[PDB]
């Protein structure tokens, strides 16, 4: 994995030694070169994971998250270069440094062979995210949002530290490859109950779990566009990655510990989606949609059937692409009206037709239109949870109604109807913005041709 | 003060601490503490205002009371052991009195009640000495008497120091009291891992001294003693805001920084000894310390508070202050976690 | 640096260079007392170094190329706009007054640095001990607020206590009418707008507040407008003083060492001019502060430390 | 009154001074070369050669082999009269059971 970590670190001299007008073009070019290089991780086998060293390996779960992560950096650089154009050159280089450093932490978070190194990188991802939100966020509430984002994650994860060090003392190792073969069944006790909670609640917060999700409609909304892209597209999916790693060590206790949390998700996706029907802030509507979509990933990991893991990792990759594009579309209208009120700018298909078509495609992938990998993940999770209990389809199916309802209302409020009269600074769509939308949507639609690469280690 | 007299007085402070470190007799331990206090009193009264004299009076009373309890513990040790070796203590009453005396010298709760006062009353350099160098000699004696330290006593002092030093700094706008309550919390962290593995005690002491010296050196470089005066730094010295950012994110124990290193290792030596509740509660209580560190970083680095007009004059004068070891300490207090297995040099 | 504690250890004492001619002499008077030549005349008869009166661009004159910067980088204020509109909206009055107090504090630090490093006395014009005599003259004219007076008293309370008074105060008795006649013969189109009550309040805070409180800590010499014309009488009066008051008597090598370590660190001298008291006439918001700071960094010879700016022709930087 | 503050800077239009703006930069040469870099190393390189690379992955997670191997094994055990799959994954001759 050292053929990826070293170019990501060489992106630091590539942004701090660049000419003052070349610091976006060079970082975009070489980050796209790293993203083209990321395809070598697709050397996956049906039996063995691509095991590099004592420190790094990459199975078919971590590989699509890595390719999405290394792809997301050029898209964040294209997204965040317009509103940081009047910024000081040193703070501009510091912003690019925080994005590069966050990618650097993420690519060795997903390839951590050992779990306490996973913890160190997993909590290392807080600090560039916290600095990006609380420094380049636009409104007043970025400080409070950074506080909530920091202290939900740390309060969930400092018991995870004690739990992982307890596994290191008990089993002898926190290598995942060793613990595939030295896993002991976890019996029923209160000690093993709080063992389970300490191993799970950090990732429950990072997914987020319903009831614990209060950081997210502040952290995703008060962030800048690159912060919202990396928080929605990757940093939620650390929780699903970590749960899929750590429920190896939590059997058969998960079979009766998952019962409340599944309820919290199966009801939570009914609530948060319903919250999306009454959100006046468009960016908050996309945030609660992200909560509603990650509730299915929580359910699928907690029922721990193969169809559920295949659908959950397909839903993670698909929601990363779709939610990143929806935040970028909301930014494309925020850079024209300078407000996030959804009812303010209306009728935008009369003025911006191709950008309305990008809104249309992002809304159709949001509502899981087949054969998108959104629908492949959604459908496979629904199959596995019908196998879990035959009544859950009601909570699934009603969700698939409400998920349609706000996905098109967002399309009807913003793009359709009569245009707002007094708003006259609606510029034509830049080539940069349509490039951003196309680089989100075209990989998402190409993955419908060959979806087996985003279906996880048990395809 | 005469600089020759200042050099002799600082060498006498260092001499008293070294005499505590290198001696095998209890009378020489007591003599080292007496010499250390007697020499550090003028460092506190350097600027000659009533706050320094009040702070020196409070420091004298607490350290004199601790020295008397120390000599009483030594005398009871001579009763019940007939000898004077600096080693384990041969009476639980002498062990209790010496643990109380060293807790009073460190400022561990509920004997913490002099640390935010005195550090407020004295200059930043003398507070640097008080919070870094004056923690060395009682932790050396606690290193050498740990076969007789009562477990419930040292753990009560440790958790009470961590909780009280956590809830202290949340109400604080004065930077020296923030460093004082941070001192109380970190001394609780040092003494909690004491009876389990004193190498991690030494690691926590060294990393804390590095980070505290970095923060006091930044405070002396920017000449700021309040939060609201530290908030003027971005308009004067923008690099110093980045330095206080990374050092305060280090002091909260946030990975991938070096200040995550001690407490993690402390947990790494307490879950081996089947203590799971206690390092969990300690780690959750450290979030309070991290909260007021985040408050300081919000005021200084991550936002821009309004400055005044006269700051435009200070744009025309570079810093002529001897910021000794500030790049070295700033690098060591942030980027040392990949060198975590270096701790075996303290074994 | 050059001077420090090590030079005080290695024998660089300051009472060895302290001679009888080493006197810090402040000349004071009204806006047209004519003292501006008189001070210079004292400097050419006692062999002292003359510092001109601190204006907006004193710090510009002492740093960099020594040339005045644009006013948005230094001052952010105008004396002429104060003469035109003393009761203005934006608060030029106390902003100008606080900038002039900081500039005079820099001048007084330069004066003590020259006196304590060279043993040469310095003749000053309207030092920091006679700056409030304009301030109250503004506040008695309603030009500034009571909060501005409180901000000035806080900054003065934490800055003037670190210093010594001058040796000699030279005051010049000029009445208000002669001041106005010299202003009208001066021809300055903004200075002619100065009223009578303002000059009268300047004279009242001179005679009632300044000179009595300086009568203890130093030796005042008061002259009319015509007997300050003859410089040699004032020089003979200074040469035959019996310096027996003030805290200049108990100044040994250690105390003057501490004072010299103070006055050579200009950021330590100028530390408490910008105390975080959010007064609207002096508070600058973050966007304007950032904009003017980044524009000041773009100026030549101002981006780095002084011996490190390649664009103004610094060499050997890769070995510095 | 309140402090000395710069007023709100107005929103700039890139299409005024650069009517051929792609939106990457206000300098037109930097803007057009940023467009060329984004479109070449985004679409011509990563998307096109990425789809070619994923299209021709060498038997991704050995599924094709697994069909062909199954086509061997069925062909062995149709003719030899064996059942197509045993319900025992491992040989019961090499499993000891806890006696009761």
């Amino acid at each position: 994995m050292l053929k990826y970590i070293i170019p990501t670190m060489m992106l630091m001299p590539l942004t701090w030694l660049s000419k003052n007008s070349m610091i976006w073009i060079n970082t975009t070019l070489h980050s796209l070169l790293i993203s083209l290089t990321s395809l070598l991780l697709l050397n996956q086998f049906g039996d063995n994971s691509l095991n590099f060293s004592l420190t790094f390996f990459s199975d078919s779960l971590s590989t699509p998250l890595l390719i999405l992560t290394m792809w997301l950096l050029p898209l964040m650089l294209m997204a965040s270069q317009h509103h940081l154009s009047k910024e000081n050159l040193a703070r501009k280089k510091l912003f690019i440094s925080m994005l590069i450093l966050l990618q650097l932490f993420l690519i060795m978070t997903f390839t951590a062979t050992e779990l306490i190194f996973f913890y160190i990188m997993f909590e290392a991802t807080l600090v560039p995210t916290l600095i990006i939100i609380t420094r380049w966020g636009n409104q007043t509430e970025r400080l409070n949002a950074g506080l909530y984002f920091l202290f939900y994650t740390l309060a969930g994860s400092l018991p995870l530290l004690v739990a992982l060090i307890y596994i290191q003392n008990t089993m002898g190792s926190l290598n995942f490859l060793i613990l595939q073969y030295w896993v002991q069944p976890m019996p029923n006790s209160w000690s093993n109950t709080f063992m389970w909670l300490a191993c799970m609640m950090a990732f429950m917060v990072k997914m987020p779990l319903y009831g614990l999700h209060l950081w997210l409609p502040k952290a995703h909304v008060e962030a800048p566009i690159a912060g919202s892209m990396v928080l929605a597209a990757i940093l939620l999916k650390l929780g699903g990655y970590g749960m899929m790693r750590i429920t190896l060590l939590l059997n058969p206790i998960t079979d009766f510990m998952a019962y409340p949390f599944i309820m919290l998700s199966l009801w939570g996706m009914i609530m948060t989606s319903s919250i999306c029907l009454r959100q006046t802030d468009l960016k908050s509507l996309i945030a609660y949609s992200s909560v509603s979509h990650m509730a299915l990933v929580i359910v699928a990991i907690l029922i721990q059937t193969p169809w559920s893991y295949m659908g959950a990792t397909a839903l993670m990759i698909a929601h990363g692409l779709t939610s990143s594009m929806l935040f970028c579309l909301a930014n494309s209208n925020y850079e024209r009206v300078h407000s996030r009120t959804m009812i303010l700018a209306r009728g935008l298909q009369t003025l911006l037709p191709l950008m309305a078509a990008w809104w249309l495609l992002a809304s159709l992938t949001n509502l899981a239109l087949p054969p998108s990998i959104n629908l492949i993940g959604e459908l496979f999770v629904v199959m596995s949870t019908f196998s879990w209990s035959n009544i859950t389809i009601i909570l699934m199916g009603l969700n698939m109604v409400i998920t349609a309802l706000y996905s098109l209302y967002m399309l009807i409020t913003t793009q359709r109807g009569k245009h707002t009269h007094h708003i006259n600074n609606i510029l034509p769509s830049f080539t940069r913005e349509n490039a951003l939308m196309s680089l989100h949507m075209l990989p998402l639609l190409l993955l419908s041709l060959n979806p087996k690469i985003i279906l996880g280690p048990l395809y | 003060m005469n600089p020759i007299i200042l050099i002799i007085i600082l060498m006498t402070v260092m001499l008293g601490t070294i005499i505590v470190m290198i001696s095998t007799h209890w009378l020489l331990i007591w003599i080292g503490f007496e010499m250390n206090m007697l020499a550090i009193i003028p460092i506190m009264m350097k600027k000659h205002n009533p706050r320094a004299t009040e702070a020196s009076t409070k420091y004298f009373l607490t350290q004199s009371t601790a020295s008397m309890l120390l000599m009483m513990a030594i005398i009871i040790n001579l009763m019940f052991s007939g000898q004077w070796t600096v080693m384990k203590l041969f009476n639980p009453m002498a062990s209790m009195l010496m643990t109380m005396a060293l807790a009073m010298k460190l400022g561990m709760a509920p004997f913490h009640f002099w640390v935010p006062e005195v550090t407020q009353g004295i200059p930043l350099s003398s507070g640097l000495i008080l919070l870094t160098w004056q923690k060395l000699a009682p932790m050396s004696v606690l290193y050498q008497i740990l076969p007789s330290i009562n477990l419930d006593l040292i753990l009560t002092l440790s958790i009470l120091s961590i909780t009280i030093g956590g809830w202290g700094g949340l109400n604080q706008t004065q930077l020296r009291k923030i460093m004082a309550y941070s001192s109380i919390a970190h001394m609780g962290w040092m003494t909690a891992v004491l009876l389990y593995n004193p190498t991690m005690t030494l690691l926590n002491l060294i990393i804390y001294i590095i980070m505290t010296s970095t923060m006091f050196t930044l405070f002396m470089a920017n000449s700021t003693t309040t939060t609201l005066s530290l908030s003027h730094t971005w308009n004067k010295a923008p690099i110093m805001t980045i330095l206080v950012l990374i050092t305060l994110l280090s002091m909260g124990g946030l990975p991938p920084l070096s200040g995550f290193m001690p407490k993690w290792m402390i947990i790494q030596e307490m879950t081996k000894n089947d203590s799971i509740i206690l390092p969990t509660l300690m780690a959750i209580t450290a979030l309070l310390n991290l909260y007021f560190y985040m408050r300081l970083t919000y005021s200084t680095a991550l936002t821009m508070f309004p400055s005044t007009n006269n700051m435009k004059m200070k744009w025309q004068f570079p810093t002529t202050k001897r910021m000794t070891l500030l790049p070295t300490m700033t690098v060591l207090s942030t980027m040392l976690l990949p060198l975590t297995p270096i701790l075996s040099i303290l074994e | 640096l050059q001077y420090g504690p090590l030079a005080y250890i290695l024998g660089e004492k300051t009472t060895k260079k302290m001679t009888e001619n080493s006197k810090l002499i402040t000349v004071d008077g009204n806006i047209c007392s004519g003292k501006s030549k008189l001070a210079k005349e004292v400097a050419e008869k006692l062999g002292l170094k003359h510092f001109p009166e601190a204006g907006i661009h004193y710090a510009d004159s002492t740093t960099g190329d020594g040339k005045p910067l644009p006013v948005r980088f230094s001052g952010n204020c105008s004396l002429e706009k104060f003469y035109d509109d003393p009761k203005s909206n934006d608060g030029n009055s106390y902003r100008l007054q606080a900038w002039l107090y900081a500039s005079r504090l820099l001048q007084y630090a330069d004066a003590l640095e020259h006196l304590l490093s060279t043993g040469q006395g310095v003749v000053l014009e309207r030092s920091i001990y006679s700056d409030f005599v304009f301030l109250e003259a503004m506040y008695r004219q309603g030009f500034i607020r009571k909060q501005c007076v409180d901000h000035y008293n806080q900054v003065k309370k934490v800055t003037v206590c670190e210093y010594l008074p001058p040796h000699v105060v030279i005051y010049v008795d000029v009445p208000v009418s002669e001041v106005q006649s010299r202003i009208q013969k001066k021809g300055n189109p903004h200075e002619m707008k100065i009223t009578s009550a303002y000059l009268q309040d300047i004279e009242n805070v001179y005679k009632g507040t300044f000179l009595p409180e300086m009568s203890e800590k130093c030796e005042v010499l008061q002259y009319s407008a015509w007997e300050a014309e003859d410089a040699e009488k004032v020089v003979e009066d200074i040469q035959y003083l019996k310096y027996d008051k003030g805290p200049w008597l108990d100044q040994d090598d250690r105390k003057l060492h501490n004072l010299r370590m103070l006055v050579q660190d200009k950021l330590e001298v100028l530390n408490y001019t910008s105390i975080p008291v959010f007064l609207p006439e002096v508070t600058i918001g973050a966007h304007q502060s950032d904009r003017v700071f980044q524009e000041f960094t773009e100026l030549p010879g101002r981006k780095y430390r002084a011996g490190y700016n390649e664009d103004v022709g610094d060499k050997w930087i890769w070995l510095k | 009154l309140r402090w000395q503050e710069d007023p709100e800077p107005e929103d700039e239009n890139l299409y005024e001074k650069n009517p051929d703006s792609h939106g990457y930069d206000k300098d037109p040469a930097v803007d057009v070369w940023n467009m060329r870099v984004v479109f070449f190393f985004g679409f011509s390189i990563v998307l096109v050669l990425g789809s070619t690379f994923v299209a021709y992955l060498p038997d991704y997670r050995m599924q094709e082999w697994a069909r062909r191997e199954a086509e061997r094994l069925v062909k062995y055990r149709e003719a030899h009269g064996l059942p197509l799959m045993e319900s025992n994954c491992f040989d019961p001759s090499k499993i000891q059971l806890p006696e009761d």
Partner: peptide, 19 residues
């Protein structure tokens, strides 16, 4: 439309004797 930076009202909350 620019980035929010703290005003005098935000800054005076950090300038008391206690928090």
């Amino acid at each position: 439309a620019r980035q929010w930076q703290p005003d005098v009202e935000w800054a005076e909350q950090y300038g008391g004797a206690v928090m």
